[PDB]
């Protein structure tokens, strides 16, 4: 008997589940407090709308929402994604003919958007531009399909925004995608209408098509700047052919239920092959959960405007007390957070005697506090640390207790 | 501006939705019959249970079934499989300790299972040993991937069974799986407890892991044969390491909430990096609908199994009804539904005079009468016609009348 896994198989690494997985229980005997875990339904501080509760129990109780719907998703719910992306994200009146139904694809959850989205157009051998800091997701896909990756910078000093100039000098003739992050996980980023109008326009000229995972779209701070806001790249007139990762997951806090969706935007005809490849590739799967894409409609265009608002606002007031609270720990300097679920912080080594990678901190903070981080590493950024923002005030001051007594006992 | 799809995108094929959707909009005034769409809850005669939809409602209620659950599956849900299998289907006392959680790995439905399945264990260049008459989601997985084919044959005159001597003809170095489906799709085959024991042998014999697509456990018609029994592979003792495909979209009737299993059958580990292989594919897409895994438990260890019975009890209604009276149209030869959703039948294409193929008669059928079916050449079969039984016996009186109508007219004297 010898039976081996595939290579395709043997590719497959997440490094966020290695590190976790492999994570040393603690010898410490205070009640772990996780701040790794990217999940927004943990302590219950964040609920889904009552709208979208309501009508998924309906087309339960209707049964007429369980048969097969096509894999591209049901008519209605792929309207309902058209609308509410029209509505909430495109401003110029004479763009907004542009988004519809007919080019939105369902899929189960991001990760299988973003599975779909690359493997629809690149192969192996092909090539594509990832950020860094940048979602894991991207490069597990892309590994384990044998796909290339040139990786970009986003630069903490111009707020995380991209690195143009290295885009461009990176761009070949294997590279057939360019994928953009905003707002961002990890780094917690919202980009400004100009450094999104500059990527549109740095893919134009370069003659790349765009995959932007907006699925944090709208999930910006507004308590520091109330003209503070979110630039779709659907907002913008370009020959550029988009493909846009949306879903429920983040904003409407059911991240669980997988479901999200792919949205291109190529007014111009540029790409239509990367339209049809999505179609093709979601045949593997088959499409989301029918009774969850029945309730679509109810959660995107029922749900008030508010109820949206105060789940970015609970988590704005978590992100700015651990903004403020942070810093104040020696060696620990944080970006600012502008919206997403995240805060990105700089770890200065140096200030430190035993601690010298950010890998280091991670394993010796979980050992000595029982606290757990995801050390920069994992997003391709080393020297930063990865916290979550979504968690109650009480959680964070508990933390950043222990980590400050914990940085003070290794400063030099 | 060069925008191409990828090579991998441009093999994937679906051959029942090209069938399908290329079919031409009937001329003829009858309202249409539908007899080629695999789903059962399109009339309402088939109804899923109390006990599922009650919990799947409480765990949304709850809202602590929300968030991200492993991408294996929750561990009450994976016992839950577990349990239920071990129950239904493991009848030899020493062999219920080999069906265990850990070697359950849920996925989105079937489809996804199969993807899972395949890839995990074979590679660009690698074969597989696929069934025919068979499902299409095994070629649609393979071409995909550029896994190549091995079509070992099931014979009508042996009521669809395996040839055995034909796959030990075909297995060769490349081949890294052999994949058998029961009951099946689209023959409607359930194997004895027999044919199945010389499958898992064989299996041992040419030494290759054995997939087998069980998506119709249980649903075995017990009208004519009141002893008939699904014999799944996990139920003997053996060397070879199993991987079973299960779900509840066709027992419990909602294949739209995507939920299906995978379970790893393995006690003298002659294969763990297939399961190893399993979690890692799995990875990619991340697990079904946390609140529909929520309801697993409820749905499958406190559905009574009277309702499962009877929902087979209404398929073999319309199924036998179909196969006494789809006999009586020239041409038509029938083999006998033993379970599943489907009936195969097939056709003396010499019978008739202007009909040279199965898609010929598929497409004037339609043209004519109104009545869609689907032409067995879409899952490698040439001569046969695959309908699905789980429609109402209203559905059947007047589709046949129609059918008899239709091969009468074209008959070759």
């Given at each position: 008997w010898d039976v081996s896994m595939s290579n395709h198989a043997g590719l497959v690494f997440n490094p966020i589940r290695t590190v976790s997985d492999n994570a040393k229980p603690s010898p410490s005997p205070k009640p772990i407090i996780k701040l790794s875990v990217g999940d927004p339904t943990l302590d219950k501080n964040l609920l889904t709308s009552a709208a979208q509760i309501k009508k998924l129990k309906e087309a339960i109780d209707s049964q007429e929402c369980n048969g097969y719907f096509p894999t591209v998703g049901s008519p209605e719910a792929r309207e309902a994604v058209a609308t509410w992306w029209r509505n909430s994200f495109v401003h110029k009146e004479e763009l907004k003919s542009t988004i519809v139904k007919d080019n939105v694809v369902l899929c189960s959850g991001g990760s299988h958007g973003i599975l779909m989205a690359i493997t629809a157009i690149c192969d192996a051998g092909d090539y594509a531009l990832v950020p860094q800091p940048g979602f894991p997701h991207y490069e597990t896909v892309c590994k384990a399909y044998g796909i290339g990756m040139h990786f970009y910078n986003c630069r903490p000093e111009n707020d995380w925004e991209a690195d143009l100039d290295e885009i461009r000098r990176l761009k070949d003739d294997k590279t057939k995608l360019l994928i953009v992050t905003n707002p961002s996980n990890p780094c917690g980023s919202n980009f400004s209408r100009k450094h999104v109008e500059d990527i549109v326009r740095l893919a134009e000229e370069l003659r790349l098509p765009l995959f932007s995972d907006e699925i944090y779209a709208g999930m910006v701070f507004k308590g520091k700047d109330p003209n503070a806001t979110f630039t779709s790249v659907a907002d913008f007139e370009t020959t550029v052919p988009r493909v846009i990762l949306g879903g429920t997951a983040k904003n409407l806090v059911v991240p669980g239920w997988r479901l999200g969706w792919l949205l291109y935007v190529d007014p111009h005809g540029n790409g239509p092959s990367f339209l049809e490849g999505l179609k093709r590739v979601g045949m593997l799967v088959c499409g989301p959960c029918t009774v969850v894409q029945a309730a679509l409609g109810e959660a995107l265009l029922n749900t008030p405007q508010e109820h949206l608002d105060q789940i970015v606002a609970k988590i704005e007031e978590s992100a700015m007390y651990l903004y403020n609270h942070i810093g104040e720990c020696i060696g620990l300097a944080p970006t600012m957070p502008r919206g997403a679920m995240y805060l990105m912080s700089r770890i200065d080594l140096e200030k430190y005697r035993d601690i010298k990678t950010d890998v280091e901190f991670f394993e010796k903070l979980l050992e000595e506090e029982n606290v757990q981080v995801l050390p920069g590493t994992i997003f391709h950024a080393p020297g930063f640390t990865r916290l979550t923002?979504?968690?109650?005030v009480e959680v964070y001051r508990e933390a950043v207790e222990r980590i400050k007594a914990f940085c003070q006992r290794h400063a030099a």
């Open positions: 923002t979504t968690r109650p």
